[PDB]
Structure 1
């Protein structure tokens, strides 16, 4: 069945999915500049672009 799955491998497949979810979050955030606000919604705030 395309719409079916065996309940006896739920734990194994869920924790393999957790492994891939960790391995796709292996990066470093990079500094990408800022710009001083000109509209008065947030006074003096520097927003990342």
Structure 2
């Protein structure tokens, strides 16, 4: 319900006619939320039987 939905459809519904835009915007947020750097961390040997 990112766009074209607020004052137009009920809370329980979704707008089937504006699906492509809303899907696209959702994926955009997905993309932005992952713009990070995979920093390293402490490695250790495993002294257990496993």
TM-score of the aligned structures, taking structure 1 as reference length: 0.75
Moved over 3 A (4+): none
Q: Please name the residue that 2:3 is paired with.
A: none
Larger relative contact order (CA 8 Å, sep ≥ 6) = 2
Unmatched tracts of structure 2, length 5 or more: 1-9
In 1, Cα distance between equivalents of 2:27 and 2:43: 34
Gaps of 5+ in 1: 42-49
* Counterpart pick for 2:43 among 20, 26, 34: 34
Cα RMSD for the two superposed structures: 0.8
TM-score by length of 2: 0.74
